[PDB]
Design a protein around this ligand. Structure first.
Ligand SMILES: CCCCCCCCC(=O)N(C)C[C@H](O)[C@@H](O)[C@H](O)[C@H](O)CO
Length: 381
């Protein structure tokens, strides 16, 4: 069977079969390897990571052979021609509808430049079989094989992860955590614009000093100012904020390729009664609680809320944080905006990636929102 992390994306795809916003596109840039070596290493990674080569019967996964994953190889006359071939592949793979019932969820395009040590790999994979950490695992093991190294035995599989979850659900310990959370969250129960903006050095240092003298993670300070600015504009004293989590709750899950991401809600109180340092401590603690219980699926919290008389949980805002052969891997952002507004922090200083629904945000309003967020952080510190 599929895990609930895999199922929620597979189900959402079945609800809108022509929606391509679950297609993940990863561009890998490789320097110092031959085309034959890259193709050979890629086939080993496909055999190693079964999630990249399964089909789904209407929902039961079934493994396919590694040679059944399409891999196209093209020779570019020069570096600019290689750019045009990748851009063509980006547009084509972004529009492709995956046949998840009969074909592997992954496709590969290897572009080699003549008289050059640079190759270019475009990996398109449906989101039910991939996530952000999977790309880092994939890119790291690619460089390992291209360097001549060896890979260790995998500790688990997506099927084992789904099995352990089936047990933890029947044991009821996941629902008991969700039922506790449902108490705190009960009162609260498209075209998009994306803009990446650097976090200023002063805001970076203020966020660290505020986090050190308060004994919380700097992300907690960033999440607090994030919730405070939006809650002030919204006119509410309580703000529901989803937190994107890697969902890899054990050591055996840290090296798997597949879909394990989870979205869990927390509530930020915006009462002027509480101090700034105390609201930060409450946010940092609730954040650590979500990280400690990453394996509690979102459907359990929804189940617990519907048991208390609510129709569901309307999450509108969310946030998250991201020698030898040279390998760089970067996702190409998915267009659209399922949620009204998300903030993602990535490392280099840090980089703030804002995605807002176009009905509320244009690019200029996003820049103003980023500045208000930086000011709130400097003020909070
Ligand atoms: C799902 C989220 C829904 C709520 C969205 C809240 C957007 C907040 C925002 O835009 N700022 C804080 C930037 C600036 O400080 C403001 O003065 C704008 O100019 C003002 O809103 C006019 O555009």
């Amino acid at each position: 069977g599929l895990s609930l992390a895999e199922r929620r994306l597979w189900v959402a795809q079945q609800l809108a079969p022509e929606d391509t916003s679950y297609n993940l596109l990863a561009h890998l840039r490789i320097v110092g390897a031959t085309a034959d070596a890259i193709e050979q290493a890629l086939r080993q990674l496909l055999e190693r990571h079964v999630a990249l080569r399964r089909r789904v019967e209407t929902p039961q996964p079934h493994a396919l052979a590694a040679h059944a994953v399409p891999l196209q190889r093209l020779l570019a006359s020069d570096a600019v021609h290689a750019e045009r071939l990748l851009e063509d592949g980006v547009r084509r793979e972004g529009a492709r509808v995956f046949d998840l019932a009969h074909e592997a969820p992954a496709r590969l395009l290897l572009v080699v430049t003549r008289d050059s040590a640079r190759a270019d790999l475009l990996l398109s994979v449906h989101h039910y079989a991939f996530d952000d950490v999977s790309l880092a695992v994939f890119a790291a093991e690619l460089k390992t094989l291209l360097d001549g190294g060896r890979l260790g035995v995998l500790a688990s599989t997506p099927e084992q992860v789904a099995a352990r979850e089936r047990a933890a659900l029947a044991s009821g310990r996941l629902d008991r955590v969700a039922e506790r959370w449902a108490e705190r969250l009960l009162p609260l129960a498209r075209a998009g614009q994306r803009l990446a903006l650097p976090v200023s050095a002063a805001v970076h240092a203020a966020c660290r000093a505020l986090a050190e003298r308060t004994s919380v993670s700097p992300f907690s300070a960033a999440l607090q100012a994030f919730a405070e600015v939006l809650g002030a504009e919204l006119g509410v004293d309580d703000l529901l904020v989803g937190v994107a989590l890697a969902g890899r709750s054990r050591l055996e899950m840290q090296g798997l390729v597949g879909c394990f991401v989870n979205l869990l809600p927390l509530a930020v109180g915006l009462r002027p009664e509480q101090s700034v340092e105390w609201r930060l401590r409450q946010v940092g603690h609730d954040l650590l609680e979500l990280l400690e219980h990453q394996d509690v699926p979102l459907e359990c919290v929804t189940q617990a809320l519907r048991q208390r008389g609510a129709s569901g949980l309307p999450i509108r805002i969310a946030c998250g944080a991201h020698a030898g052969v040279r390998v760089e891997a970067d996702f190409i952002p998915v267009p659209g905006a399922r949620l009204d507004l998300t903030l993602w922090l990535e490392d280099q200083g840090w980089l703030a990636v804002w995605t807002g629904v176009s009905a509320i945000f244009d690019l200029h309003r996003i820049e103003r929102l980023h500045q208000a967020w930086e000011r709130r952080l400097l003020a909070n510190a």
